[PDB]
């Protein structure tokens, strides 16, 4: 274990945050692409 938090809320969905480096930009920003590298992560579900 690392930490425990008494948040006291219900959670049904979650999302992953990924840090990206701006490979290049465009004027009048149209959400140009970034680069972090292969972003390889797993996700699993626990059961009783």
């Amino acid at each position: 274990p690392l930490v425990d938090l008494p948040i006291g809320i219900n959670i049904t969905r979650f999302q992953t945050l990924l840090a990206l480096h701006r490979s290049y930009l465009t004027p009048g920003d149209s959400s140009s692409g970034w680069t972090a590298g292969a972003a390889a992560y797993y996700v699993g579900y626990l059961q009783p």
């Epitope: 701006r22 930009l25 009048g28």
Partner: antibody, heavy 125, light 105 residues
């Protein structure tokens, strides 16, 4: 997307308070640091400063120390500032622009993505 | 911190134009070059290192040397009449130079 449309030219007497503002009407007012740069004929560009709406921290320029009072309010979704003690030599065209970022150390990783049409000001004496 | 550049530059159309924006310790500072045309507002063409943003035609180019920044122009046309201003975010402030006016015969 954002347009940063502002008011047109204004005529006023010398020595009076000068008020100018830029309104987006496009994308969100926040999330986009707004800076003002002055364009003059045969004198290059002059940098005034920048104000971050969400952060609320305003940075001043060396020559504009104490002559500008920049304020921004999220509720009104408009950025306006006050100017005083303006001389005829200081008359020029003012422009407003966005930086796409709201972090103090991240402006260098960006540029003035969009500019305004320019609001020329004339001083009558 | 202080920027000094030639007042103007002239070059024949279709040639390679090299513009030098000299200063004091401007290498490794993320300089930015802007373009302003007569009757049109300034636009962004270079960002953070000689970097051409996608959507602008790939006619501008350049590199940042130890103590000098250079801009290379390819496929110059008549419409390229504009003024180039080189600036950088130094000491949490922006400094704008005199700028150069490009002349085409």
């Amino acid at each position: 997307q954002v347009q940063l449309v502002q008011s047109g030219a204004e005529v006023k007497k010398a020595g009076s308070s000068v008020k100018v503002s830029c309104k987006a009407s496009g994308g969100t007012f926040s999330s986009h640091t707004i800076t003002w740069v002055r364009q003059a004929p045969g004198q290059g560009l002059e940098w005034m400063g920048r104000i971050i709406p969400i952060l609320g921290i305003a940075n001043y320029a060396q020559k504009f120390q104490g002559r500008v009072t920049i304020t921004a309010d999220k509720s009104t979704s408009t950025a306006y500032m006050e100017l005083s003690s303006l001389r005829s030599e200081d008359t020029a065209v003012y422009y407003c622009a966005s930086l796409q970022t709201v972090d103090t150390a991240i402006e260098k990783y960006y540029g003035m993505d969009v500019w305004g049409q320019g609001t020329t000001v004339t001083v009558s004496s | 911190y202080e920027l000094t550049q030639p007042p103007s530059v002239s070059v024949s159309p279709g040639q390679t134009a090299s513009i030098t924006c000299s200063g004091d310790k401007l290498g490794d500072k993320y300089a930015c070059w802007y373009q302003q045309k007569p009757g049109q507002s300034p636009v962004l063409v270079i960002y953070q290192d000689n970097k051409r943003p996608s959507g602008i035609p790939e006619r501008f180019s350049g590199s940042n040397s130890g103590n000098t920044a250079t801009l290379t122009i390819s496929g110059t046309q008549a419409m390229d009449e504009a003024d180039y201003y080189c600036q950088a975010w130094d000491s949490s402030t922006a400094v704008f130079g005199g700028g150069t006016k490009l002349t085409v015969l």
